[PDB]
Amino acid sequence: NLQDARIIIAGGGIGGAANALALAQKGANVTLFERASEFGEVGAGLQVGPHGARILDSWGVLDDVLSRAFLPKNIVFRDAITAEVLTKIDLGSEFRGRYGGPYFVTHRSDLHATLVDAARAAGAELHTGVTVTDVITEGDKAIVSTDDGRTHEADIALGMDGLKSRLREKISGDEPVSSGYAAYRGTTPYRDVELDEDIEDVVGYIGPRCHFIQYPLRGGEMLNQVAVFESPGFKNGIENWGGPEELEQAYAHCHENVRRGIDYLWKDRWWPMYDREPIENWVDGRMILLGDAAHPPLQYLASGAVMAIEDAKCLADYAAEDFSTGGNSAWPQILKEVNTERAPRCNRILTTGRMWGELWHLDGTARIARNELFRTRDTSSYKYTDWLWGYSSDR
Amino acid sequence: NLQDARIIIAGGGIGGAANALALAQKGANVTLFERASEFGEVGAGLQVGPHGARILDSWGVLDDVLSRAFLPKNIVFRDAITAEVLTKIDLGSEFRGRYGGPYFVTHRSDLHATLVDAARAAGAELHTGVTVTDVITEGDKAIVSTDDGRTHEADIALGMDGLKSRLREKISGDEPVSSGYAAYRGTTPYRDVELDEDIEDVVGYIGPRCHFIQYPLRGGEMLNQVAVFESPGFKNGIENWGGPEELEQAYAHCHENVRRGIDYLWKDRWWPMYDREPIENWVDGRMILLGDAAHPPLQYLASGAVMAIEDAKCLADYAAEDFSTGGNSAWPQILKEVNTERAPRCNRILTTGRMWGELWHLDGTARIARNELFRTRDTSSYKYTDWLWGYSSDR
Numbered sequence: 001n002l003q004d005a006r007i008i009i010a011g012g013g014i015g016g017a018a019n020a021l022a023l024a025q026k027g028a029n030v031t032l033f034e035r036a037s038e039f040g041e042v043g044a045g046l047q048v049g050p051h052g053a054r055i056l057d058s059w060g061v062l063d064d065v066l067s068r069a070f071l072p073k074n075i076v077f078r079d080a081i082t083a084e085v086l087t088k089i090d091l092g093s094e095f096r097g098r099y100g101g102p103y104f105v106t107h108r109s110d111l112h113a114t115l116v117d118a119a120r121a122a123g124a125e126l127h128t129g130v131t132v133t134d135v136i137t138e139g140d141k142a143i144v145s146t147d148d149g150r151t152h153e154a155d156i157a158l159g160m161d162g163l164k165s166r167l168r169e170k171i172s173g174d175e176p177v178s179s180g181y182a183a184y185r186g187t188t189p190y191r192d193v194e195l196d197e198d199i200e201d202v203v204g205y206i207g208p209r210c211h212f213i214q215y216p217l218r219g220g221e222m223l224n225q226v227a228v229f230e231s232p233g234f235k236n237g238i239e240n241w242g243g244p245e246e247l248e249q250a251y252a253h254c255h256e257n258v259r260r261g262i263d264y265l266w267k268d269r270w271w272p273m274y275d276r277e278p279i280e281n282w283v284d285g286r287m288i289l290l291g292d293a294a295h296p297p298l299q300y301l302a303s304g305a306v307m308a309i310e311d312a313k314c315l316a317d318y319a320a321e322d323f324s325t326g327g328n329s330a331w332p333q334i335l336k337e338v339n340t341e342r343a344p345r346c347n348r349i350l351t352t353g354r355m356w357g358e359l360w361h362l363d364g365t366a367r368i369a370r371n372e373l374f375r376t377r378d379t380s381s382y383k384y385t386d387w388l389w390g391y392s393s394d395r
Numbered sequence: 396n397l398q399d400a401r402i403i404i405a406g407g408g409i410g411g412a413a414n415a416l417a418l419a420q421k422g423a424n425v426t427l428f429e430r431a432s433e434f435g436e437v438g439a440g441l442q443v444g445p446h447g448a449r450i451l452d453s454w455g456v457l458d459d460v461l462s463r464a465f466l467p468k469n470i471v472f473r474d475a476i477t478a479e480v481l482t483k484i485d486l487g488s489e490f491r492g493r494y495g496g497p498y499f500v501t502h503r504s505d506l507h508a509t510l511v512d513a514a515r516a517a518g519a520e521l522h523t524g525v526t527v528t529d530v531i532t533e534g535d536k537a538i539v540s541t542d543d544g545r546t547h548e549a550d551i552a553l554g555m556d557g558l559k560s561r562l563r564e565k566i567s568g569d570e571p572v573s574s575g576y577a578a579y580r581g582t583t584p585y586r587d588v589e590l591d592e593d594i595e596d597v598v599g600y601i602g603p604r605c606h607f608i609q610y611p612l613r614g615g616e617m618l619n620q621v622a623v624f625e626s627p628g629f630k631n632g633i634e635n636w637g638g639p640e641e642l643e644q645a646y647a648h649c650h651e652n653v654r655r656g657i658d659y660l661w662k663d664r665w666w667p668m669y670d671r672e673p674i675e676n677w678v679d680g681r682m683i684l685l686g687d688a689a690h691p692p693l694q695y696l697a698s699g700a701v702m703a704i705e706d707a708k709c710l711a712d713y714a715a716e717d718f719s720t721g722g723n724s725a726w727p728q729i730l731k732e733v734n735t736e737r738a739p740r741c742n743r744i745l746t747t748g749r750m751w752g753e754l755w756h757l758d759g760t761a762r763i764a765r766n767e768l769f770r771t772r773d774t775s776s777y778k779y780t781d782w783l784w785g786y787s788s789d790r
């Protein structure tokens with residue numbers, strides 16, 4: 001356990017919250033600073049495969065998250081032009097047996113609140129409206145600066161300040177890499193969505209230069225919808241690219257079931273999709289980058305928040321194992337071993353995820369090939385998914 | 396049979412020769428005019444699947460063609476960058492049982508000579524150094540004009556004057572459509588080719604914007620090699636595009652086994668690859684277009700000469716069936732019924748063949764998808780090939 005340990009976490013998204021929870025459950029003294037004046041997340045869906053669900057269960061929060069989640073029976077891929085089913089991933093008891101938990105979907109806001117509440121309950125000291133302005137390592141401590149003029153001492157600090165991380169600048173000068181794709185979301189009362197057939201699955205329509213995803217939330221009462229498309233504005237240097245004037249033309253070539261979806265999306269806000277090139281080293285002295293600060297992906301594998309959750313589990317587990325015997329002096333080795341375990345995993349998600357989205361967005365003969373590949377696969381095989389959903393950091 | 400019938404054939408390529416043979420075997424009076432001063436073909440390979448081999452057998456010439464041919468055990472597709480086997484089409488006894496004949500390869504020159512010799516033996520009157528300058532229909536006869544100032548009367552005329560057909564202008568004003576790809580050939584003494592492993596198959600290396608094919612000829616004594624690549628010169632308006640200064644860069648990204656091949660090719664001559672858009676109607680009065688004049692493909696399905704051979708069989712069979720009972724008056728109906736049977740078949744080859752070559756030449760994620768599609772297929776299935784190799788015109 002981590003009783004005598006002190007950890008400061010810079011950032012209170014899903015990542016920082018999950019780390020606060022995992023560390024406080026080991027008995028660590030955890031202080032978390034969040035920039036925003038309240039804890040919160042977007043009131044729309046995310047997907048959490050068994051690689052995240054098993055970890056939530058270990059922390060004792062999965063039952064509760066599920067009480068407010070939805071349990072899809074399958075992930076279903078459809079052609080966005082014809083609406084034809086291409087393939088399904090069965091998320092039933094064999095899936096759950098194999099991977100040690102369910103594949104679920106829920107509101108980001110609910111998952112985030114659940115984590116924050118559990119971290120507090122476990123002893124974490126969370127602070128809102130506080131920005132971490134610097135982290136340095138001096139001797140055997142991290143020294144953390146905040147925007148109220150204070151400095152704080154801890155054993156280690158976690159840089160969990162997201163895609164636009166400034167703490168990352170201590171290690172890398174890279175900038176976010178634009179995908180040229182933009183994401184829109186919507187949640188609609190389920191019954192207000194014009195549906196030809198009801199939805200109890202995660203449905204992904206994949207088409208030339210676009211996709212469209214639907215899934216139920218909150219026990220089937222709401223439908224989450226997500227539209228991702230290639231922005232022509234981006235290729236022309238528009239700074240504020242991907243705006244809603246692009247949506248109608250971006251989908252004009254798709255099936256009516258996809259085109260009807262667009263009307264339900266929120267149009268006041270969107271998410272231009274960026275990632276970063278993979279980096280191996282996430283550690284600067286007694287600071288480690290985790291979550292999107294270390295490994296921000298494009299969302300094709302629906303695993304960014306899951307990776308941040310995995311990060312928490314690995315950090316807490318490896319530290320509790322080694323700090324007990326080696327104390328504070330052991331922290332740099334612990335960070336190194338966490339980085340060595342996590343980088344190959346997460347960097348494969350970044351890179352493979354780019355290829356996976358490309359595979360979705362093919363046109364022409366390439367689309368013909370992709371459709372037939374999906375149709376004819378051995379659905380009993382897990383070779384395309386075991387690397388993702390079957391990973392564990394357990395040593 | 397066709398005893399009282401008179402047919403004039405404009406063109407003496409593989410198509411015209413095969414039609415001369417098929418018609419003369421039915422007892423028709425056949426006169427064939429060829430522009431060139433000698434009958435001949437290129438001294439390099441072509442492939443003849445069972446859809447052509449069965450027909451040659453019916454005419455009694457397959458045994459003889461085979462005595463000078465090669466019988467590959469498989470068609471083998473390899474990735475042009477890695478040289479990895481992707482899939483094989485087994486050409487063994489089950490294949491031959493299914494499709495009614497062998498898949499063989501031979502010299503174009505030999506097949507052509509064999510057909511010409513057999514057409515002569517069967518009674519066809521062949522003439523070299525004679526160009527057909529016009530064909531018109533007057534009453535119940537075709538009237539054919541030649542470049543020695545003569546005119547000739549027949550019951551029907553076949554326009555078999557190739558990709559650059561002028562007779563086609565009677566029916567369509569279309570021009571050849573450039574693929575932007577160019578083909579080079581070579582034959583090398585088998586033993587002079589630097590081979591890591593010996594070849595007893597048709598091998599197709601398929602890569603980004605290029606392919607490379609090898610197969611043995613003449614009982615394994617020579618190796619046929621064919622290089623097809625996307626010409627940058629074409630996209631820049633070079634009239635004489637696809638020249639050999641393009642070959643080295645076109646293959647630079649390929650595996651050594653492909654790159655070594657280029658040195659063996661003839662560099663003095665090449666074949667810029669054109670086809671035509673499919674047309675339904677091939678008949679103008681008592682003239683019918685057949686062979687490349689009617690349906691010139693890109694060569695990805697290795698079936699252009701085979702289609703011309705099929706044309707001959709259908710024409711001869713359908714005419715012999717109906718002329719016997721209806722005489723000369725029946726010829727326009729016969730041509731219509733031959734056109735109705737042949738156009739959907741051949742036009743599917745034109746169109747599908749374009750998609751098939753595109754499938755070969757994919758890059759990026761599309762190539763990744765295509766490779767995996769090929770690898771994982773049900774090799775016991777014939778669904779990708781029965782339309783091609785299992786067709787018959789028999790009614």
Ligand SMILES: Cc1cc2nc3c(=O)[nH]c(=O)nc-3n(C[C@H](O)[C@H](O)[C@H](O)COP(=O)(O)OP(=O)(O)OC[C@H]3O[C@@H](n4cnc5c(N)ncnc54)[C@H](O)[C@@H]3O)c2cc1C
Nearest residue numbers: 011013014015035047132161162291292302303304305306
């Ligand atoms: C359209 C879309 C769909 C997605 N869907 C899925 C999905 O289905 N499943 C999945 O697992 N993932 C998904 N993701 C990925 C997931 O959203 C992210 O990977 C994940 O939320 C990252 O969490 P984080 O805590 O590392 O970073 P963030 O969520 O960015 O949190 C960083 C926090 O740090 C705060 N902050 C910033 N700087 C400072 C500072 N200096 N001091 C203090 N606080 C600071 C910010 O206010 C923010 O609260 C998706 C992403 C997108 C864009």
Ligand SMILES: Cc1cc2nc3c(=O)[nH]c(=O)nc-3n(C[C@H](O)[C@H](O)[C@H](O)COP(=O)(O)OP(=O)(O)OC[C@H]3O[C@@H](n4cnc5c(N)ncnc54)[C@H](O)[C@@H]3O)c2cc1C
Nearest residue numbers: 406408409410430442527556557686687697698699700701
């Ligand atoms: C690189 C390449 C590879 C190929 N490989 C294969 C393969 O493996 N298998 C396959 O089956 N097919 C293949 N083909 C296709 C095949 O070559 C052609 O489809 C076929 O040869 C066409 O035969 P044809 O008799 O209709 O026309 P052509 O071969 O063009 O013959 C037309 C003839 O008419 C003559 N002529 C022209 N105008 C006149 C006139 N006015 N009067 C008299 N004579 C005239 C010409 O001199 C010529 O001899 C390939 C083609 C290419 C380019």
Ligand SMILES: [Cl-]
Nearest residue numbers: 299302303304
């Ligand atoms: Cl993601």
Ligand SMILES: [Cl-]
Nearest residue numbers: 301302303304
């Ligand atoms: Cl992801």
Ligand SMILES: [Cl-]
Nearest residue numbers: 694697698699
């Ligand atoms: Cl051809």
Ligand SMILES: [Cl-]
Nearest residue numbers: 696697698699
């Ligand atoms: Cl062809």
